[PDB]
Structure formats: structure tokens, C-alpha cells
């Protein structure tokens, strides 16, 4: 067994291709050796080494012992790999890094940082007598007994969480202590406050060890809630302030609405008012508020300006994960365009402080952003999409674009730019002028058959590379790459028409717009692009482009997508390069309103090209004076507030819209051009009415618990079976579930990688991928373990989508726990689950005194109150819906519902004592409702919570003594409507 492996290592000890043998021998109980080698790309030799070592390792692992397996992992794991720089300890930031003029004597006082650290203070004196390294003085900040608590990132409302902690005792002698918890209102604890924070149960920590701490809580309210933890000992008392983040059930869904304010109609029709209506979505989680933020910025570029200049973050595409070099470049896109606006238009006076210091800061942030991409650069000055992966023509072109634009304000290394350009034109430009891709990275999915898809992708890549080379040409103006530009421009000229998609037509048009704008074929291409224009209005208020050609698809999209904004952006930039000012105003209005709070758009490419279009347009047209009185108010409610927008301040902070009324943004006679964006955030219980571009399936298994999450691509119309483009599999983990990071590492780090990048961020396992197949399923498999105990575990979500087409997606719910049944909660240890949901009255309870049934109905808090008959039961995810018939109405405070119309009720599934039987009648009285627009009519849905009075109501009178029961019931029912309390 040892020799059988000594031969393997010795065979590949000095082989050039040695790792392929190594990660070939790695364990993979889910795929055969040939299936794993089928993904190998690093060449033919690597496939055979991988296959050999895989087969031999699998044969040796038959009926092994744990010691034999581990010893084998020792033999392989040492001779073949090299090394990797990494560290197991964190070191805090240093401090006191200052210089002082010491007149022979100077004392300075401060406060030691909050840390358990042996600090080392070092002084170095400089004078006309030379240098003096003082004796290093030590200062150990140390605590001998202290508590720490592990609070999870988020917790779903209703979940019973076990909060784990530890008290550390570094003293050599044990001691007594007690930890107590601070009761906050929304956080339901099983015990009760004494005087008001928990109870002190005295325990003992042994010397030089620790003791465990646990607190079970159940959040009833959503949001960030402060919880304190007190550690008391005979030598003192410490308070640890903590915060629990409570998240709603279901999926977060975010919609956007945009409005442009042109009070004098300079760029189009006058636009002084707009009404953002309050509309409740269909599957809204009950007892959750519809959040929506309002952002009113000063210019077309105002949103990006606020994004960069306000340093509270910020990524304009937070919904997209990091990992690709594209993300690192996109990080510098907004800062660049802000700098380009401020410098080209000379608008540095916007700052009330020193503009030179602000230009300094932006220059520094631009450089800081510029170092981020250095990691993705190879020795030959090519760039790789994935760190350590193969160099990509596509990404090298994009880096050349961003760097080439940035060089204007932060000069770039000419020798580096030259080597990158030459790596492009010397190796990956074909005789016909097109460019070919080296790596397997598929940034975009195009239509057509395999040959037609090939032509389309070749055209796209050639135009993209041409844009990059044009944007970076002035840094290294070589005749060789200009000749390359001529050949590529020729390929574009001859092969663009007849077009196969508006997308490739637009990008080819913009690439050619960067060169000779007088070639006849270019003019033909621009005409064909104009022919596909869509307009809203006549005379058009908006002008935009659909990415599909008209002769292939005549339907007009109702909402924008990334390809729509990107095609429109390329066409806009082409028109700006042609100085076609009459044609762009409705396009600018459309791109401006399609923008999003934060400055970004749908994906990455559309964002950068749209930002460039808006910015270049803003610099090309006259800068108008800015002066508006912008009033935002609710329709049937008070005025929210109003501000006077001027050039002094116009990047005002956003404002949250709390009230449930329709919003109205209006302005009088003004000068300028403002933007008004509203982001609506809701939480939904279902995903059925959403278009799924992926078949998804996900399960948890027991292994000899592991998550297996599979996806498969659903090709659109006329799309080939080759699979998707760059994809993302985002798996939200349930509360308290932790993923095995070794399994994920093993799935990306090897030559047989299944995924191209992974990360764990905020309870999400985010994997990225070059392509998800259409023919079959692709599955990520990784082990999971339970970090802390969670009761009433809320399901999590599994989302996969195309990185550059977030509209091609599919979201599915799953739970890691099988746990049923939910029969009953048994007495006490119960008030927290049944806290915020209804309790059914005692069946045929004759003690209810008819006047207590009326005073409860006439309560001003109780909005509605009437008698219904249940028609259907339904269980949807985490809630239960009851279809009932509205029989007799007894009260209506708010909107009205029709008699004998269908009424829906909803209760949290985790509520047992409100069990309703189909077909029985009930008297139901409660607060509030939801008014939805379904099909073409209204619908009302009523949640079942606390203070919702429900009672079983038989129709006949053969219930023995309940004859009298219905007597008093019909007494109340008779008295309520004849009075009007």
C-alpha cells in the first residue's frame, strides 16, 4: 500500500503536470473518473494523468481503514502540492502611528483600545544628532473573566433560536457567576422578567477554562432589536450589548419606479408632477410592511454622484456577487464616471469644502480601485476572469476599456498596456479579422443554431474587443494594433448585416462608431439599428430598443431587462458619436428612468454603458441652473416634506415612505432637471407566478446531512442546447445551518472543478459557473451541520440566474428540516408560539355573556367583524389560507366587502389553537385587511392574529343546550346592527 503510492508520487514528483494527478486522486463519491475528466480543459496530458491517478486511487480506497486513508492523504498531500500563503490568526490594526515634536519632554494621554492584546509601543527619535531607537515598552491589555455571545446574522420571525455563548475564566482558581438576559419587548422569552432582565442562577466556572451559556428566544417583531447580556461575578458586573436582526418570512422582492422632472420642458414635454400609487402585491407575507424608499437627486448624473460622494458604502450592484474580475472593474466604474463629469465639466464647486481635497480623495479611490484588478492579471499581461484561471480575451478587452478610460485621470503603465494589447492582437485575432476566446468563459447566450450561434458570438466578441482596444489605444499607439483594428473593423463591416439580433447589431454599431464614421456600410448598420427603435408616445416621449429583432419577435416588453438597457446604451453611444442630438432625448429619458436608486441598472455591462451614455450626454449639453421647490406628500394624508433643490445641495439623502398612501412628488416653476426614483421592497410567500428559466431541485440527505442543489437551463426560443452563460447559484442557508467549506473548496480548486468560484456571505452559499447545461442537471453537493438549535425553522431559498441576465432566473423554497407534525404545543412553554395569533373560542361555550361579545365588537380597535362560512383549506409554504363565504356583515370600519362574496383568511401555520374546519360557520372579528387586485377585481384577505375574536357557530339547533347558545348569539347579532355604537 505504501509502495503502491510511492510509485505514484515518484512518478509525478517532478512532472510538469503534477496537480492533475493530485486532484485526480481526490475523493468524489458522486462522479466516476471519466465524468470528472470530462470537465478537464488544461489539456490532453492532464486528462490522462488525472484519469490514471483517479482510477488507481479509487481502487486502493476499496475496504480501506481510516489510518490507511489518512496516511495516503499524507503521501499525496505532501509530495505533489507546493505551498500556499495563509494565516490562522488575525492581528488588529496598529495605532499611535504619529510623529511628535518632543521638547526634551512631552507627555500625551489616550485610551487603550478595546482588545485582549499584548501591545508593543516603539519610539524612534530623529534629531540633528541622528537616530535613536528607544527601548520597546510592553502594555498587555488583558481580562481574566469575560463573557461573549454568538448572535447569528439574521433570524426569521417566529423561529425559536438558541443563543449560545461562553464565559471565559483565565484565572487559575474557579469562581461563581451568573449571566442574565435583557428582555426587549419584541423578543419573547420563556421565563419572565424579575426586575426587568431575566434571573441570576449561580453557576461555577472551573479554573482556567470556560462555561457554556444558552438563552432560548423567539422574535415576534421584524427589525433590529437590542438585547443585552449581563455577566455577574463576585468581583464585578459586565454588560455586553448585542443586536438581533429579525427578518421576515418568504422571499425579498424589489421593484423600481422612475420619473424625470423637467419643469420647463427643455429636454421634452413638461413634467412637474407624478403619482407613485400604493399597490399591495399578491402574495405579500402578512403583517409585514411594504417598504419603499424615495430618492430625488439633482441631475441625470446625480444618482451616481450621490453613490460615490456619500461613503456609507456602496456597491451599485449589491445583488450581484463578487468573484469575477468584472466585479473588480465595475467597482471602479462609478468613481471613474463621477471623476470624468467633475473634471471635464469643471464642476468642482459643488463641494462646499476644499475641492482640491475632494479631487484628491476621488483620485486615491480610483487608484485604490485600480489595484484591485492586479490580482487577475497573469505574467504575460493577459487577464483571467477567475483568479488563477485561464486568460480570457473577453475580460482582457474589458480591462483594457476600463483602464484605457481611467488613464486619462490616473496614468497607467504604458508597458503593461502595450503587453496586454499585443497579447490580444498577436495570438487571438484570426485572419478574417475576428477575435477568438481562449477560455471557456461564456459571458452571453445568443440565439440561433450552433453555426448561427457561432457567427453571432464571433461578431459580439470582435466588437467587444474592438471597443476595448479603441478605448486604450492612445496609451500605446502601435501600427501593429492599428492594423488589427482595421482588419477587425472590416470583419464587422462585412458580417454585421444581415443582423441576427438587435443586441449584436447595436454593439457592432457602437464599435464601428469608435472609428471611421464615414464608411457606407457603417451608415447602413446605423440605419438598420434605427429601424428597430421602439417609441413610447407620438411624438415620442420615450425611445428605446428591444434586444430581439422585430422580424423575429413583434411583442413589446412591459418591463426592462439588462439586454434592453445594454442595447439601448450602445445605440445611444453610437448616436452621441454621430452628434445626432435630435434623436437621443427620448433615449436619455428612458435610460434615466430605467436607472435604479444607487445609480446602477440590471447587470454589469448595461450599467457601465448606460452610465457612460448619461454622463457623456450630461457633458455634451448645456448645464442648466438648478432651482426647484420639490414637495413630496401623501394624497390622503399629511405632507411628507419638501426641499428647495439648488446647485448648492441636490444630492439629498433618501427618505423612507412609511404610510400606506399613494405618494405624490410635485414641483412648481423651476430651473433644472431632477430625477425621482422609488424602490419598493416587499416580501412574498410564493414564486409560482414567476417565470422560471431553470429547472431546480434541492434536497438534504443523510450520508454514510448534506445539501444537494441541482439546476438545469431552460433555453429560450431559438436558443441552442449548449447551455446557459455565466451563471450564479445562490443558496440561502436556513437559520443556524452552517456549510462545510471544505466540500465547496474541493469543488472549485481542482482541475476537474464543477464550479468556478464560491463564497459564503451573510448566510448565503454563492457559487458561480461558466455555464449550466440544458441537457442535464448540474448539482452542487456540500455537507452541512447544525450550528445552534432552531425551532419552527423557516424555509430558505435557492436562486440560480444568469449573471449578465438576472431576468433569466428561478427561485425555489426549501427547508433543511423534515419536521412535522405541528399538532399542539402542550400547556406552558407555549406563550411565545401562540403569542401573536388567534385563539378559537371554547366550542359551544355558553358563558360568553352577549354583552362581552358586543363590547368586543364595538371596540374602536376592531376594524371588521362579521359571520362567515369556510369553504376550503389550503397550506401555502409557512401559512394557511381559508377560503370562506361572507354571510352577514356586522361591522365595517375600513373598506367594505360584498355579502356572499369570497373572503380569504390567513394564519401562521405555527398556530394550533385556531384550527378551522372546512364547511363550518364562524364569527370572526379583527383588525385590518389586505386589498389586492386579482384578475380585474378586488379581493380582501384577513390575517388571524391576537385580538382576533373567532367562535364556532352551528347553523341548526340540535346541539342540545347550545340551543340557548345560539339564542344569545343571535341576541348579539340582532343588537349590533340596530344600534350603531
Amino acid at each position: 500500500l505504501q509502495k503502491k503510492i510511492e510509485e505514484i508520487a515518484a512518478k509525478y514528483k517532478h512532472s510538469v503536470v503534477k496537480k492533475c494527478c493530485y486532484d485526480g486522486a481526490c475523493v468524489n463519491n458522486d462522479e466516476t473518473c471519466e465524468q470528472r475528466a470530462a470537465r478537464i480543459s488544461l489539456g490532453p496530458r492532464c486528462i490522462k494523468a488525472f484519469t490514471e491517478c483517479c482510477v488507481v486511487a479509487s481502487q486502493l480506497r476499496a475496504n480501506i481503514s481510516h489510518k490507511d486513508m489518512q496516511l495516503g492523504r499524507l503521501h499525496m498531500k505532501t509530495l505533489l502540492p507546493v505551498s500556499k500563503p495563509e494565516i490562522r490568526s488575525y492581528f488588529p490594526e496598529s495605532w499611535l502611528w504619529e510623529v511628535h515634536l518632543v521638547p526634551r519632554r512631552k507627555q500625551l494621554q489616550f485610551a487603550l483600545p478595546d482588545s485582549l492584546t499584548t501591545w508593543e509601543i516603539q519610539g524612534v527619535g530623529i534629531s540633528n544628532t541622528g537616530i535613536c531607537v528607544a527601548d520597546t515598552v510592553k502594555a498587555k491589555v488583558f481580562k481574566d473573566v469575560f463573557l461573549e455571545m454568538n448572535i447569528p446574522y439574521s433570524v426569521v420571525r417566529g423561529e425559536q433560536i438558541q443563543l449560545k455563548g461562553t464565559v471565559y475564566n483565565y484565572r487559575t482558581s474557579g469562581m461563581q457567576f451568573c449571566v442574565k438576559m435583557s428582555a426587549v419587548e419584541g423578543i419573547c422569552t420563556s421565563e419572565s422578567p424579575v426586575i426587568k432582565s431575566s434571573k441570576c442562577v449561580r453557576q461555577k466556572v472551573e479554573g482556567s477554562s470556560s462555561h457554556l451559556v444558552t438563552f432560548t428566544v423567539l422574535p415576534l417583531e421584524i427589525g433590529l432589536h437590542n438585547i443585552n447580556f449581563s455577566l455577574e461575578t463576585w468581583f464585578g458586573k459586565e454588560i455586553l450589548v448585542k443586536t438581533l436582526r429579525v427578518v421576515p418570512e418568504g422571499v425579498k422582492r424589489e421593484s423600481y419606479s422612475g420619473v424625470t422632472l423637467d419643469p420647463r420642458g427643455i429636454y421634452g414635454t413638461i413634467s412637474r408632477r407624478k403619482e407613485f400609487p400604493y399597490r399591495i402585491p399578491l402574495d405579500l407575507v402578512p403583517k409585514t410592511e411594504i417598504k419603499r424608499i424615495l430618492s430625488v437627486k439633482g441631475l441625470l448624473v446625480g444618482e451616481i454622484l450621490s453613490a460615490v460622494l456619500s461613503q456609507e458604502g456602496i456597491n451599485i450592484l449589491t445583488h450581484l456577487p463578487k468573484g469575477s474580475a468584472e466585479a473588480e472593474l465595475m467597482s471602479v466604474v462609478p468613481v471613474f464616471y463621477v471623476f470624468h463629469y467633475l473634471e471635464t465639466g469643471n464642476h468642482w464647486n459643488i463641494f462646499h469644502s476644499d475641492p482640491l481635497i475632494e479631487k484628491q480623495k476621488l483620485k486615491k479611490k480610483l487608484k485604490e480601485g485600480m489595484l484591485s484588478i492586479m490580482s487577475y492579471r497573469n505574467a504575460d499581461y493577459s487577464y483571467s476572469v477567475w483568479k488563477g484561471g485561464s486568460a480570457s480575451t473577453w475580460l482582457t478587452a474589458f480591462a483594457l476599456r476600463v483602464l484605457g478610460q481611467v488613464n486619462k485621470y490616473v496614468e497607467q503603465n504604458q508597458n503593461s498596456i502595450c503587453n496586454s494589447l499585443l497579447w490580444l492582437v498577436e495570438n487571438y485575432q484570426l485572419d478574417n479579422g475576428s477575435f477568438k476566446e481562449n477560455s471557456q468563459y461564456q459571458p452571453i447566450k445568443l440565439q440561433g443554431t450552433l453555426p448561427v450561434e457561432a457567427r453571432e458570438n464571433s461578431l459580439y466578441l470582435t466588437a467587444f474587443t474592438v471597443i476595448g482596444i479603441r478605448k486604450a489605444f492612445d496609451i500605446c499607439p502601435l501600427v501593429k494594433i492599428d492594423t488589427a483594428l482595421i482588419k477587425a473593423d472590416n470583419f464587422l463591416l462585412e458580417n454585421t448585416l444581415p443582423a441576427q439580433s438587435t443586441f449584436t447589431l447595436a454593439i457592432s454599431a457602437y464599435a464601428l462608431s469608435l472609428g471611421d464614421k464615414t464608411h457606407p456600410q457603417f451608415r447602413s448598420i446605423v440605419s438598420a439599428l434605427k429601424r428597430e427603435a421602439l417609441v413610447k408616445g407620438n411624438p415620442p416621449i420615450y425611445r428605446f430598443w428591444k434586444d430581439n429583432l422585430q422580424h423575429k419577435d413583434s411583442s413589446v416588453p412591459n418591463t426592462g431587462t439588462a439586454r434592453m438597457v445594454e442595447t439601448t446604451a450602445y445605440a445611444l453611444l453610437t448616436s452621441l458619436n454621430l452628434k445626432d442630438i435630435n434623436y437621443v432625448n427620448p433615449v436619455i429619458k428612458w435610460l434615466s428612468e430605467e436607472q435604479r436608486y444607487g445609480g446602477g441598472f440590471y447587470s454589469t455591462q448595461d450599467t457601465i454603458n448606460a452610465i457612460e451614455g448619461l454622463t457623456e450626454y450630461s457633458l455634451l449639453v448645456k448645464q442648466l441652473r438648478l432651482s426647484m421647490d420639490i414637495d413630496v406628500s401623501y394624497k390622503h394624508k399629511g405632507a411628507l416634506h419638501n426641499y428647495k433643490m439648488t446647485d448648492k445641495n441636490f444630492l439629498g439623502r433618501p427618505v423612507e415612505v412609511l404610510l400606506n398612501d399613494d405618494l405624490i412628488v410635485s414641483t412648481g416653476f423651476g430651473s433644472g432637471l431632477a430625477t425621482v426614483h422609488v424602490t419598493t421592497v416587499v416580501h412574498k410567500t410564493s414564486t409560482s407566478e414567476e417565470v422560471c428559466s431553470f429547472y431546480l431541485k434541492i434536497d438534504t440527505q443523510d450520508i454514510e446531512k448534506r445539501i444537494v442543489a441541482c439546476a438545469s437551463y431552460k433555453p429560450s426560443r431559438e436558443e441552442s442546447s449548449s447551455g446557459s452563460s455565466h451563471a450564479v447559484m445562490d443558496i440561502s442557508l436556513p437559520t443556524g445551518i452552517s456549510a462545510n467549506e471544505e466540500d465547496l473548496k474541493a469543488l472549485v480548486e481542482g482541475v476537474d472543478q464543477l464550479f468556478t468560484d464560491y463564497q459564503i456571505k451573510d448566510g448565503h452559499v454563492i457559487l458561480q459557473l461558466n455555464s449550466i447545461p440544458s441537457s442535464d442537471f448540474l448539482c452542487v453537493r456540500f455537507r452541512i451541520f447544525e450550528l445552534f438549535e432552531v425551532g419552527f425553522l423557516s424555509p430558505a431559498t435557492f436562486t440560480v440566474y444568469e449573471y449578465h441576465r438576472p431576468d433569466k432566473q428561478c427561485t425555489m423554497f426549501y427547508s433543511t428540516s423534515n419536521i412535522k407534525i405541528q399538532k399542539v404545543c402542550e400547556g406552558a412553554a407555549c406563550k411565545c408560539v401562540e403569542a401573536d395569533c388567534g385563539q378559537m373560542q371554547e366550542e359551544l361555550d355558553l358563558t360568553i355573556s352577549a354583552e362581552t361579545r358586543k363590547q368586543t365588537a364595538c371596540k374602536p380597535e376592531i376594524a371588521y367583524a362579521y359571520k362567515v362560512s369556510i369553504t376550503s383549506i389550503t397550506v401555502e409554504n409557512v401559512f394557511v389560507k381559508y377560503k370562506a363565504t361572507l354571510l352577514d356583515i356586522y361591522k365595517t370600519g375600513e373598506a367594505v366587502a360584498e355579502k356572499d362574496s369570497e373572503i380569504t383568511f390567513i394564519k401562521k401555520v405555527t398556530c394550533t389553537n385556531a384550527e378551522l374546519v372546512k364547511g363550518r360557520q364562524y364569527l370572526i372579528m379583527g383588525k385590518e385587511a389586505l386589498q389586492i387586485k386579482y384578475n380585474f377585481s378586488f379581493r380582501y384577505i384577513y390575517p388571524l392574529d391576537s385580538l382576533t375574536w373567532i367562535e364556532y357557530w352551528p347553523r341548526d339547533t340540535t346541539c342540545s343546550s347550545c340551543q340557548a347558545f345560539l339564542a344569545n348569539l343571535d341576541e348579539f347579532a340582532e343588537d349590533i346592527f340596530l344600534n350603531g355604537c
Binding site: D380, N413, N419, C476, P477, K480
Partner: protein, 49 residues
Amino acid sequence: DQCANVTCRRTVDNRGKRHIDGCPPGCLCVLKGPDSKDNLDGTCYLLAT
């Protein structure tokens, strides 16, 4: 033709400066290899107008 195939070279004088030579006029030197090595060699590229 001119800077078609002539190597160029970057070197260090006793003062620490970097200098490039081997490259005829009207051309640019493109140097391969880690930019921190003082002694680098590359080739000349014809440059444009």
C-alpha cells in the same frame, strides 16, 4: 519596416536610473517580465502617427 525585429533593452547606470536602448528612433520598447527587475529586455514596436 524599421523597428521590425530589433531587440531593446533596459539597464541601470551607476546612479540608479533606468535607460532604454537598442531601439531605433520613432519606435517604442516593449519589455517582458516582472517590472521590478532593473535589467529587462524586450523588442521594438514600430509606433504610429
